[PDB]
Amino acid sequence: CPTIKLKRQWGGKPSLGLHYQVRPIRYVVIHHTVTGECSGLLKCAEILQNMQAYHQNELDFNDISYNFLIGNDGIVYEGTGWGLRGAHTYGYNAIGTGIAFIGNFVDKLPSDAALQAAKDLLACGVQQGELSEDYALIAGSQVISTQSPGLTLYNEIQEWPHWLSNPHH
């Protein structure tokens, strides 16, 4: 079970509005940030802080759009966190957990540590009752008009158990 970097622990601002999710959650949506990569708290916190500010100020979201975000270091950074609605995926915020790999993975994969942290996050979520034992894992590109999480990353995750090939758009 990965130790999650909580919101305060990376210097993030409190959410401007809470919307509680049903438990358990049935969909996990995978994204990339279309940002540079990062490792370690110092560079990861800068990106997340700027991203949250952009989401709250320019995009009018209550908080950083993703539920969780994962760095090259293989640490899971709390975005909206478990049980709270983000704004990462149209039609899948209330009923989904949005997980973004930090970086751009059209042409490359995230680090092995990032990929393993993600699998651990999903298994622990099932174990803790955060996710349905038969949760569906999907790419953002399956359900909204986007390339996220990037073709290469997309090719990776369609091989994990729980991948669902036909989620509703």
Author numbering: 11 to 179
Paper text:
The Drosophila peptidoglycan recognition protein SA (PGRP-SA) is critically involved in sensing bacterial infection and activating the Toll signaling pathway, which induces the expression of specific antimicrobial peptide genes. PGRP-SA is a secreted protein circulating in the hemolymph (the insect blood) of Drosophila. Contrary to the general belief that PGRP-SA has lost enzyme function and serves primarily for PG sensing, we found that it possesses an intrinsic L,D-carboxypeptidase activity for diaminopimelic acid-type tetrapeptide PG fragments but not lysine-type PG fragments, and that Ser158 and His42 may participate in the hydrolytic activity.
We have determined the crystal structure of PGRP-SA to 2.2-Å resolution and analyzed its peptidoglycan (PG) recognition and signaling activities. Although the crystals were grown from full-length PGRP-SA (177 residues plus 6×His-tag; residues numbered from the N terminus of the purified polypeptide chain, as determined by N-terminal sequencing), clear electron density was visible only from Cys11 to Pro177. This helix, together with the L1–L4 loops and the central β sheet, forms a prominent extended surface groove, which in PGRP-LB includes a zinc cage. However, PGRP-SA has lost two of the four zinc-coordinating residues present in PGRP-LB; accordingly, the rPGRP-SA crystals exhibit no X-ray absorption at the zinc edge, and we found no electron density for possible metal ions around the groove. PGRP-SA contains two disulfide bridges (Cys11-Cys134 and Cys48-Cys54), whereas PGRP-LB has only one. In the PGRP-SA structure the Oγ of the Ser158 residue is positioned within hydrogen-bonding distance (2.95 Å) of the Nδ1 of the highly conserved His42 residue.
